[PDB]
Design an enzyme around this catalytic site. Structure first.
Site, mmCIF file in Angstrom:
data_model
loop_
_atom_site.group_PDB
_atom_site.id
_atom_site.type_symbol
_atom_site.label_atom_id
_atom_site.label_comp_id
_atom_site.label_asym_id
_atom_site.label_seq_id
_atom_site.Cartn_x
_atom_site.Cartn_y
_atom_site.Cartn_z
ATOM 1 N N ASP A 239 0.826 -1.200 0.000
ATOM 2 C CA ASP A 239 0.000 0.000 0.000
ATOM 3 C C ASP A 239 0.865 1.258 0.000
ATOM 4 O O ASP A 239 0.394 2.311 -0.356
ATOM 5 C CB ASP A 239 -1.007 0.005 1.147
ATOM 6 C CG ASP A 239 -1.995 -1.142 1.060
ATOM 7 O OD1 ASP A 239 -2.826 -1.153 0.123
ATOM 8 O OD2 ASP A 239 -1.967 -2.028 1.948
ATOM 9 N N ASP A 240 2.146 1.143 0.361
ATOM 10 C CA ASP A 240 3.011 2.322 0.422
ATOM 11 C C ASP A 240 3.073 2.944 -0.958
ATOM 12 O O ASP A 240 3.303 2.265 -1.957
ATOM 13 C CB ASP A 240 4.424 1.955 0.889
ATOM 14 C CG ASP A 240 5.296 3.164 1.114
ATOM 15 O OD1 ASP A 240 5.394 3.584 2.287
ATOM 16 O OD2 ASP A 240 5.873 3.717 0.136
ATOM 17 N N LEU A 241 2.904 4.258 -1.013
ATOM 18 C CA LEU A 241 2.811 4.910 -2.317
ATOM 19 C C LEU A 241 4.129 4.997 -3.073
ATOM 20 O O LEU A 241 4.142 4.925 -4.298
ATOM 21 C CB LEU A 241 2.162 6.265 -2.180
ATOM 22 C CG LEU A 241 0.814 6.262 -2.866
ATOM 23 C CD1 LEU A 241 -0.291 6.670 -1.884
ATOM 24 C CD2 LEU A 241 0.939 7.188 -4.070
ATOM 25 N N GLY A 242 5.230 5.138 -2.333
ATOM 26 C CA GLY A 242 6.578 5.093 -2.902
ATOM 27 C C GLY A 242 6.833 3.748 -3.551
ATOM 28 O O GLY A 242 7.349 3.667 -4.672
#
Ligand code: NA
Ligand code: NA
Length: 290
Positions: A239-242
């Site tokens: 889920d981390d956008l990076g």
């Protein structure tokens, strides 16, 4: 003066490049390639610093005991990610995009951790929620400044992340004073009440995830970030956008993919090395991207 002897070269400058604000005590300070912080060891804060004397030798200096070297050494190997990367590098060679990542950050080696304690990892992951990493690191620095330990040794000041007891004393208002939202201050205080919290590092991923997500305001991304970054478990925070951006750039021609698609990539391509590759992805997102 102690030495950590490595079987493989490590590029220390790349290890240090992982820190976003190396000069500001977050609590870590890196100045002229010398890493340092205070760490709480058997109930008090001790000064520890580290720097390479060569490509395969890390020197450690500090005011802890000779009999405490074994435990400090373990903590530093794990935190800095100094473990033999031979197998990781071979694995990365077997995938075109992993090989590129390996070559762009060659000598970075295996992943370390984001924290020297479970408590620090949880608190920092809560802080980081929905804000920029630079802003999160400044907030951690304020909290460190106010409530963390500070040790003067050898002309230098060494800074520690606050203990759970320090945070309880600081209280919700102490944290709000540092710039933290009421609810994040409340949550860090609620976590600080947890006894035996350091034991979580040796929990199974499943039980640890259930525990972390049982706190109101800790969900999937925060839990998986803690699991991977702070607990050293092979749990991939898709889920981390990076992460989604990096994986999308690498495998889908810069077309932004869902967390579920990114998870599928990790299972298919990253396997047992997903936690290590995660750190290369973070570097990639930071450093390779009118
Ligand atoms: Na720093
Ligand atoms: Na939750």
């Amino acid at each position: 003066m102690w030495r950590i002897e490595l079987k493989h070269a490590v590029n220390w400058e790349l290890k240090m490049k992982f820190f976003v604000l190396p000069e500001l005590p977050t609590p870590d300070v890196v100045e002229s390639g010398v890493w340092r912080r205070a760490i709480v060891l058997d109930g008090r804060a001790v000064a520890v610093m580290a720097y390479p004397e060569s490509e395969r030798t890390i020197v450690v200096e500090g005011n802890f005991e000779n009999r405490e070297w074994e435990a400090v050494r373990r903590k530093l190997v794990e935190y800095l990610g100094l473990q033999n990367p031979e197998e990781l590098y071979r694995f990365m060679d077997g995938d075109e995009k992993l090989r590129m990542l390996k070559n762009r950050f060659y000598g970075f080696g295996r992943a370390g951790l984001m924290s020297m304690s479970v408590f620090e990892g949880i608190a920092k992951a809560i802080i980081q929620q929905q804000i920029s990493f630079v802003v999160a690191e400044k907030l951690a620095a304020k909290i460190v400044g106010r409530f963390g330990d500070e040790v003067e040794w050898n002309g230098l000041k060494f800074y520690g992340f606050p203990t759970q007891e320090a945070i309880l004393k600081a209280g919700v208002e102490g944290l709000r004073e540092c710039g933290l939202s009421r609810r994040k201050a409340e949550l860090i205080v609620e976590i600080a009440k947890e006894e035996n919290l350091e034991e979580l590092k040796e929990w199974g991923e499943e039980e640890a995830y259930e525990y972390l997500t049982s706190f109101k305001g800790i969900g999937r991304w925060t839990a998986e970030l803690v699991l991977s970054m702070a607990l050293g478990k092979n749990v991939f925070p898709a889920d981390d956008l990076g992460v989604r951006r990096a994986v999308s750039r690498l495998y889908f021609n810069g077309e932004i993919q869902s967390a579920e698609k990114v998870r599928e990539i990790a299972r298919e391509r990253f396997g047992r090395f997903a936690r290590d590759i995660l750190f290369y992805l973070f570097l990639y997102d930071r450093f390779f991207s009118v």
